[PDB]
Amino acid sequence: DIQMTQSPSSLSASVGDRVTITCRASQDLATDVAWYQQKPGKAPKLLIYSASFLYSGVPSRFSGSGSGTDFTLTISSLQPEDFATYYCQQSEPEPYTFGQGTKVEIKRTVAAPSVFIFPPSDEQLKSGTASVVCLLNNFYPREAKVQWKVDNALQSGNSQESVTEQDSKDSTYSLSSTLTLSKADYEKHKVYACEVTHQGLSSPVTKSFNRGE
Amino acid sequence: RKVCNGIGIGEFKDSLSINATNIKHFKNCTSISGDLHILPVAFRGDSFTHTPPLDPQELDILKTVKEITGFLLIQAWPENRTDLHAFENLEIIRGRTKQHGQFSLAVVSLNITSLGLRSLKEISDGDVIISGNKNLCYANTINWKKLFGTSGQKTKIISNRGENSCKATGQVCHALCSPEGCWGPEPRDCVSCR
Amino acid sequence: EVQLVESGGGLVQPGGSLRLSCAASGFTLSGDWIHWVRQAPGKGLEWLGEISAAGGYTDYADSVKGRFTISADTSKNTAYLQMNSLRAEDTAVYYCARESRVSFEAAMDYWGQGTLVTVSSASTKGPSVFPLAPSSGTAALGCLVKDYFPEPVTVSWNSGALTSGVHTFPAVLQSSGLYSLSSVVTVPSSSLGTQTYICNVNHKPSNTKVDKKVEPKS
Ligand SMILES: *[C@@H]1O[C@H](CO[C@H]2O[C@@H](C)[C@@H](O)[C@@H](O)[C@@H]2O)[C@@H](O)[C@H](O[C@@H]2O[C@H](CO)[C@@H](O)[C@H](O)[C@H]2NC(C)=O)[C@H]1NC(C)=O
Numbered sequence: 001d002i003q004m005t006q007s008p009s010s011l012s013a014s015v016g017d018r019v020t021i022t023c024r025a026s027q028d029l030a031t032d033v034a035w036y037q038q039k040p041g042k043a044p045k046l047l048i049y050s051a052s053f054l055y056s057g058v059p060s061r062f063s064g065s066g067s068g069t070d071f072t073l074t075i076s077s078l079q080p081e082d083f084a085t086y087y088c089q090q091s092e093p094e095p096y097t098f099g100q101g102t103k104v105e106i107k108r109t110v111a112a113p114s115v116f117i118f119p120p121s122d123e124q125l126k127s128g129t130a131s132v133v134c135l136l137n138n139f140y141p142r143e144a145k146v147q148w149k150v151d152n153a154l155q156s157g158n159s160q161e162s163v164t165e166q167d168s169k170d171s172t173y174s175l176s177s178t179l180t181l182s183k184a185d186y187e188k189h190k191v192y193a194c195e196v197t198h199q200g201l202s203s204p205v206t207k208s209f210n211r212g213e
Numbered sequence: 214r215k216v217c218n219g220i221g222i223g224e225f226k227d228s229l230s231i232n233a234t235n236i237k238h239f240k241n242c243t244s245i246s247g248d249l250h251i252l253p254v255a256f257r258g259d260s261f262t263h264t265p266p267l268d269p270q271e272l273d274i275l276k277t278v279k280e281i282t283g284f285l286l287i288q289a290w291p292e293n294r295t296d297l298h299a300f301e302n303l304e305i306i307r308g309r310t311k312q313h314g315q316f317s318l319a320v321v322s323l324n325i326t327s328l329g330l331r332s333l334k335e336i337s338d339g340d341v342i343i344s345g346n347k348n349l350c351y352a353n354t355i356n357w358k359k360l361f362g363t364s365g366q367k368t369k370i371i372s373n374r375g376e377n378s379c380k381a382t383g384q385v386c387h388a389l390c391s392p393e394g395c396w397g398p399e400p401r402d403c404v405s406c407r
Numbered sequence: 408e409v410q411l412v413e414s415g416g417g418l419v420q421p422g423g424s425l426r427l428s429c430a431a432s433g434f435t436l437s438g439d440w441i442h443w444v445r446q447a448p449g450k451g452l453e454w455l456g457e458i459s460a461a462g463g464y465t466d467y468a469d470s471v472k473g474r475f476t477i478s479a480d481t482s483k484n485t486a487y488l489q490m491n492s493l494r495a496e497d498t499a500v501y502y503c504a505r506e507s508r509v510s511f512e513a514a515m516d517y518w519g520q521g522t523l524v525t526v527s528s529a530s531t532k533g534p535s536v537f538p539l540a541p542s543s544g545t546a547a548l549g550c551l552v553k554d555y556f557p558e559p560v561t562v563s564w565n566s567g568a569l570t571s572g573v574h575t576f577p578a579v580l581q582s583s584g585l586y587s588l589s590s591v592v593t594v595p596s597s598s599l600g601t602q603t604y605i606c607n608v609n610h611k612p613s614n615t616k617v618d619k620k621v622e623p624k625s
């Protein structure tokens with residue numbers, strides 16, 4: 001096959017920044033390169049064909065350049081909604097090799113999480129398992145430390161986190177941490193606490209509840 | 214071996230259905246002396262009688278039941294469940310008492326794809342009505358006449374999954390089954406083997 | 408106006424087979440070229456093959472030749488991807504896409520939403536759904552969607568009438584080998600007594616929908 005090698009692998013840029021993504025073909029493709037934008041959980045969307053031609057309805061901040069082996073996609077002024085993975089494609093002939101993608105994430109000002117805690121439901125408890133959920137809502141940057149304390153004892157090996165993809169409007173993230181205990185373990189302790197450390201917090205924030213109260 | 218009262222008798226007097234509060238009383242029962250009713254009210258719960266909704270997992274309590282002397286009425290079932298899993302060990306329905314004085318087995322408006330009554334060898338008296346189970350196949354494969362103990366017992370299988378649709382989707386007896394039919398698609402569901 | 412919709416994704420045991428469908432609307436498959444492209448979770452795009460429904464000409468990636476094949480029913484305006492002898496590594500979102508006629512090249516101008524095929528020696532399992540009760544200005548509430556397999560589930564609130572402030576988290580595989588996620592929403596605290604909140608969970612791999620009303624705990 002023809003190889004299509006994209007660089008950089010990822011980038012973090014601010015709103016209004018110029019962004020340049022590169023794609024190198026292993027042989028001469030003339031101008032037979034297309035570019036796509038893929039948002040998470042969505043199908044790729046066609047941006048550019050024949051290396052430099054803007055597909056109908058695509059914003060003019062997107063442009064493409066190059067011929068032969070070296071091709072570039074430029075976003076003249078990055079917008080928050082431009083968070084995506086961008087792909088080049090060898091568009092002629094088969095097998096139409098796609099590049100490995102470049103992930104573009106948005107850099108913005110610090111924003112503190114709003115923190116919430118949720119006890120297990122009585123419905124789940126009758127089933128023999130307790131899930132305790134901590135929510136960190138709408139924060140930046142992504143990096144956060146979230147720790148579970150049960151009657152002041154730090155928990156390890158019994159929680160998992162999930163983080164949303166960057167919001168296309170304000171570039172923030174949200175995060176869930178879920179602590180899993182047996183009903184028996186859950187019922188032998190009183191205080192359930194989620195402690196959050198983050199750049200936007202002057203000191204860590206704790207949300208907690210007392211079982212049964 | 215343990216005999217327990219059915220719905221309407223003893224601990225189950227004035228109960229409409231097996232339900233969250235009464236289902237514990239069937240623990241370890243091998244024979245129901247009376248009838249079993251499983252109704253939508255069981256799963257919805259009932260404010261008037263202070264009955265919480267039945268956790269469908271509690272139905273597993275019934276797996277020890279081998280005999281019902283009266284009738285079995287099932288008009289609600291976890292939509293999640295493809296067969297009558299809790300009754301996989303039921304061997305005999307006697308129909309000494311019958312629903313409306315007529316029916317010993319009534320399986321009505323469920324989401325099941327097969328009956329799964331793999332241990333059932335006899336329905337001594339009463340009619341069988343299998344009605345309105347839109348996903349249900351396999352029921353017409355059973356030789357009901359052979360399960361029956363009283364001349365003139367009837368089986369009516371109405372408004373379940375169309376015969377053509379069961380054939381088109383492959384929901385017919387496994388190749389390993391004899392002509393006696395089956396309770397579902399698996400070799401364990403065959404009434405008898407080839 | 409042009410739309411493509413893939414269906415047929417779900418759990419397949421290793422060694423098993425599956426046929427995916429791609430329903431076109433707004434244009435006829437006959438007269439155009441359609442491509443199948445897949446994407447393993449967190450990975451890049453891989454072209455699989457193409458078909459001209461008119462004439463029935465097909466071409467395939469070397470990686471799947473002999474195992475995957477493409478067909479089309481012009482009366483149904485639907486294309487198909489037949490996949491034999493599936494392996495764990497074939498786990499991916501499968502897309503169909505129309506080849507554009509803006510130019511000579513195979514720029515792909517319309518894509519379906521994709522359908523997720525999971526190849527695993529595991530069992531299909533529908534989700535348990537538990538409320539994340541509010542009030543513990545703004546109230547947060549949600550649903551915990553736990554212990555399902557395979558992916559994916561979708562979640563809406565009040566049948567899609569509530570979208571503002573909703574976060575449905577990426578599923579995470581638990582140590583049990585079953586997925587779990589939460590969907591949360593923030594709403595005015597003052598609305599808790601006057602607005603019903605229901606999460607609608609769809610687990611297409613097990614053909615299961617679940618609705619859960621989430622209310623303040625008493
Ligand atoms: C049927 O679904 C339930 C869960 O579905 C429910 O979630 C509840 C919490 C409520 O919100 C309901 O309204 C909602 O529909 C599953 O729990 C059940 O699966 C069983 O779960 C048991 C505990 O996880 C487990 O012990 C069983 O093994 C499991 N059943 C099996 C054999 O898979 C579903 N029942 C099925 C699939 O038969």
Ligand SMILES: *[C@@H]1O[C@H](CO)[C@@H](O[C@@H]2O[C@H](CO)[C@@H](O)[C@H](O)[C@H]2NC(C)=O)[C@H](O)[C@H]1NC(C)=O
Pocket residue numbers: 224225226227228229230231232233234235236254259262264
């Ligand atoms: C569910 O079963 C319970 C029994 O566990 C029923 O409760 C009985 O109800 C009758 C009629 O109201 C009373 O005579 C009994 O005193 C009740 N017994 C107990 C222990 O509570 C209940 O009625 C059933 N509910 C439904 C709808 O079937």
Ligand SMILES: *[C@@H]1O[C@H](CO)[C@@H](O[C@@H]2O[C@H](CO)[C@@H](O)[C@H](O)[C@H]2NC(C)=O)[C@H](O)[C@H]1NC(C)=O
Pocket residue numbers: 292293294295324325326348531612613614615616
């Ligand atoms: C009601 O029963 C139907 C029939 O079994 C269920 O739909 C099936 O779900 C399985 C996955 O477990 C699919 O593989 C089948 O293709 C489905 N059947 C068809 C052809 O529709 C349905 O899930 C049940 N309802 C609930 C709420 O569980």
